[PDB]
């Protein structure tokens, strides 16, 4: 995974990151990498910060606590949020307890908030769980959720499958030096040869 293009040409302003920066990642070797992207409140896109509290997304859909992530918060106006509208962000907004990260709780049933369920009537103490964002051609960037990418900094013991280094350096001859080819290290002077190897 050549993360070089992440920092080769990019203009991600207001970048925060806890742990290790994704740049210069070829130094470290691992087996599995996870980048989690999800949909959140449209008005809380600027309000996502470690700690703190809030009325929304605290007693119904709880954000992960002690989350170790790398917030690359670049605004988007052409990749997503297509003009006219969009109806794909449908999730439960009312629940009695929290929600574990990546919990797929979708049901056509009417959520019951009070002690007495409603018999499919729009009245008191009964609210529908599913909600669709009222996207408009001029809805506003403050209400249309713009994706902020975040990863998972985690460790686990396993033999590496996606892993490999690359440093590159000019090849110098006729001067003895410590050298490191692919895996094999040593010290000496390197000269041209006439030996023939098999391919």
């Amino acid at each position: 995974a050549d993360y070089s293009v992440l920092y080769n040409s990019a203009s991600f302003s207001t970048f925060k990151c806890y742990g290790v920066s994704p740049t210069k990642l070829n130094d470290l070797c691992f087996t599995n990498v996870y980048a989690d992207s999800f949909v959140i409140r449209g008005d809380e896109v600027r309000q996502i910060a470690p700690g703190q509290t809030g009325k929304i997304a605290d007693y119904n859909y709880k954000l992960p606590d002690d989350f170790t992530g790398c917030v690359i918060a670049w605004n988007s106006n052409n990749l997503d949020s297509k003009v006219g509208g969009n109806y794909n962000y449908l999730y439960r907004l009312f629940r009695k307890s929290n929600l574990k990260p990546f919990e797929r709780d979708i049901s056509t049933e009417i959520y019951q908030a009070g002690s007495t369920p409603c018999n499919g009537v729009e009245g008191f103490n009964c609210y529908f769980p599913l909600q669709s964002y009222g996207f408009q051609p001029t809805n506003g960037v403050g209400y249309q959720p713009y994706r902020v990418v975040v990863l998972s900094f985690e460790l686990l013991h396993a033999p590496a499958t996606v892993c490999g280094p690359k440093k590159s350096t000019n090849l110098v001859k006729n001067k003895c030096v410590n050298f490191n080819f692919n895996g094999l290290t040593g010290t000496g002077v390197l000269t041209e040869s006439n030996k023939k190897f098999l391919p």
Epitope: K82, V83, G84, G85, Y87, Q131, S132, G134, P137
Partner: antibody, heavy 126, light 107 residues
């Protein structure tokens, strides 16, 4: 659902006209309207729109600057002022209505055309 | 300003025939297409909206699906009352653009 149209003119060289299309059979105050023209045998073309609240208006590229829209909830009727008449503006105009999609208790517009009127053949000559 | 195209322009079939109409958008309009059927002396009427739904009342013979750029309208049986014209329409934003038109015939 029924839309009536009126305001035809046999000849209109560079003058002012005011078309009017009414609505009946539903709530006039909870829907948005349209004006979709049609040349005699050509394709179908849209010229103007009015929002369901009436605060916002949009026109077309060759329509803006000369055509004006208006509406009234007291009479449940909207009007189109139509001016700066060229010799190539003959067409067949229609009054239309937006579809309202209801998802999760929320109503949305700008999704198609459902109700169409009889149609007015508007022509200009010299 | 999206230029929005429909094909073909002349096909003919009668009663028990299945026909296909292709329709293309210059940009990615996703699943926002409207299909109509206009009689020569009557106003056009909507058949399929949101690129997947069918208006309540239209016969279920017509069927169309699509997402993004290309869209296909399939008619299983061309009964001798559908010899009319079809127009596409993209609802991404203003201005609204219609199709060039497709004419049906009876063989």
């Amino acid at each position: 659902v029924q839309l009536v149209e009126s305001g035809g003119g046999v000849v209109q060289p560079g003058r002012s006209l005011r078309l009017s299309c009414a609505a009946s059979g539903f709530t006039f105050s909870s829907y948005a309207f349209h004006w979709v023209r049609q040349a005699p045998g050509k394709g179908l073309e849209w010229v103007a729109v009015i929002s369901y609240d009436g605060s916002n208006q949009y026109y077309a590229d060759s329509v803006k600057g000369r055509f004006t829209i208006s509406r009234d909830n007291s009479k449940n009727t909207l009007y189109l002022q139509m001016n700066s008449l060229r010799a190539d503006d003959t067409a067949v105009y229609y009054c239309a209505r937006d579809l309202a999609i209801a998802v999760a208790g929320t109503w949305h517009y700008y999704n198609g055309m459902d109700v169409w009127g009889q149609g007015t053949t508007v022509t200009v000559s010299s | 300003d999206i230029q929005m195209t429909q094909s073909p322009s002349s096909v003919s079939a009668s009663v028990g025939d299945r026909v296909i109409i292709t329709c293309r958008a210059s940009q990615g309009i996703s699943s926002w297409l409207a299909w109509y059927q206009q009689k020569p002396g009557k106003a056009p009427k909507v058949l399929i909206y949101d690129a997947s739904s069918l208006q309540s009342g239209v016969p279920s013979r017509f069927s169309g699906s699509g997402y993004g750029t290309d869209f296909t309208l399939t008619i299983s049986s061309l009964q001798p009352e559908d010899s009319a014209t079809y127009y596409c329409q993209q609802a991404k934003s203003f201005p609204i653009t219609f199709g060039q038109g497709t004419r049906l015939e009876i063989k």
